[PDB]
Amino acid sequence: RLRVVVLGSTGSIGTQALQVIADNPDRFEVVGLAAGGAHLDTLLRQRAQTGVTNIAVADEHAAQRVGDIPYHGSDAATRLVEQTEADVVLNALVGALGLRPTLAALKTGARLALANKESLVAGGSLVLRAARPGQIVPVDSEHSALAQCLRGGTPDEVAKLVLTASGGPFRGWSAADLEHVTPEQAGAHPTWNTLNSASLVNKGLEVIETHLLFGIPYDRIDVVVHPQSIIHSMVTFIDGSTIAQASPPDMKLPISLALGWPRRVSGAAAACDFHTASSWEFEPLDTDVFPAVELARQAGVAGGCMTAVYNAANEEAAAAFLAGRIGFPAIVGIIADVLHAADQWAVEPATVDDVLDAQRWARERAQRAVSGM
């Protein structure tokens, strides 16, 4: 029985992970839960339902609303990871909260089932340095597919990695059409991922993660638009053979595989039914209209903290768009402007502080680009 710590337990990935674990008590036992703090109601139900009292809340003010959370405030999730004996740490925390628990999980020797994108994109080689071969197992559909498809040959036999992309809500839109796009049109409803999916920045992040997880050069990582999202990614080998992973969209599949790696979890998700006719479409990404992916490749080839800069510039430009300060195509315009000025940030991140410094620099630089304009 594998002891699992679920970080970011109240989001979509976390709840689905708990469902997989609840369905499979023979293979998994939850030994810890952590939440950012936005969905304290969910976490308290999770404590009541799992009987797990080993729980953390990052938001100090949210935790004080309850008064009996064992780890709270600054680095609560990291401390839970450091102090809990576990076989697997699932990291589905949001944004910046993910990095230090990723590093803590890796130092414990546990398998890291990684859902948090910022960890790898921002942390880069800082994170890779902390890991042994095979210790990081990806939770993202695309990277899970790749990991599975890579079993099709040896590393020297790999020619290309092909990521599929839905294309988002603006697939087939003109550059002129995007000028008028509103946040709500992108599926975003401002508050105290859906936008990054619309801008294709999410796909650029996945390209960076692909390079870091699997060690394949950026010019051998392709993106293909596949609106059905049935094929989740593919690997082309040196002999001409492509191996692909397919399933009806259901995140419980890649979540189960990361938890149970390398053993598959029986009945995790429904398989492709070929009793109905279906048609799977493939088309090139319109790189003229959606340059986010090529910009990610650019940041990634330059290297080091440039990927933290790419991500941080995106967050700030995206927030400006949600605020109504800039238009939609300006998001990737600002990312490009920030990277062009980021010559000091190609260095490898030596410490967590290097990452946070790069991110702070990038945000301020994006703010300057936003303000004028």
Ligand X SMILES: O=C(c1ccccc1Cn1cncn1)N(O)CC[C@@H](c1ccc(Cl)c(Cl)c1)P(=O)(O)O
Angle at 132 between CA 131 and CA 135, to 5 degrees: 80
Closer by beta carbon to ligand X, 11 or else 304? 11
Structure tokens at 87: 């076989």
Question: What is the C-alpha separation between 335 and 330, in angstroms, rounded?
Answer: 9
Q: What's the min distance (Å) between Cβ of 141 and its own copies?
A: 10
Nearer to Mn ion, 207 or 331 (CB): 207
Residues of this chain, 236-295, that bind its own copies according to CB under 8 A: 236-248, 250, 253, 256-257, 263-272, 274-284
**307 interacts with ligand X by CB under 6 A:** no
Q: Are 5 and 84 in contact (CB under 8 A)?
A: yes
Residue number with CB closer to Mn ion (168 or 291): 168
Rounded Cα gap, residues 201 and 197, in angstroms: 6
Among 47, 100, 143, 203, binds ligand X (CB under 6 A): 203
Write down the least CB distance from residue 140 to Mn ion, Å.
4
Residue 165 binds which of ligand X, its own copies, Mn ion, none (CB < 5-8 A, kind-dependent) = ligand X
State how beta strands 158-165 and 231-237 pair: antiparallel
Q: Taking the CB of residue 276, how many other CB atoms lie within 10 A of it?
A: 6
Residue whose C-alpha is closest to residue 7's, from 107, 95, 66: 95
* Cβ pair 118, 140 in contact under 8 A: no
Cα 251 to Cα 16: distance, rounded to the nearest angstrom: 8
- Residue 270 vs 373, nearer CB to its own copies: 270
The nearer residue to its own copies, 52 or 235, going by C-beta atoms, is 235
**141 forms part of the interface with ligand X (CB under 6 A):** yes
Contact set for ligand X, span 231-250 (CB under 6 A): 232, 249
The CA–CA distances, whole Å, from 26 to 1, 2, 265, 266 equal 6, 9, 11, 12
Residue 13, annotated ligand binder? yes
Give the residues lining the site for its own copies (CB under 8 A).
148-149, 151-154, 157, 159-160, 162, 222, 224, 231, 234, 236-248, 250, 253, 256-257, 263-272, 274-284
Give the residues lining the site for ligand X (CB under 6 A).
140-142, 165-166, 168, 193-194, 197, 202-203, 229, 232, 249, 251
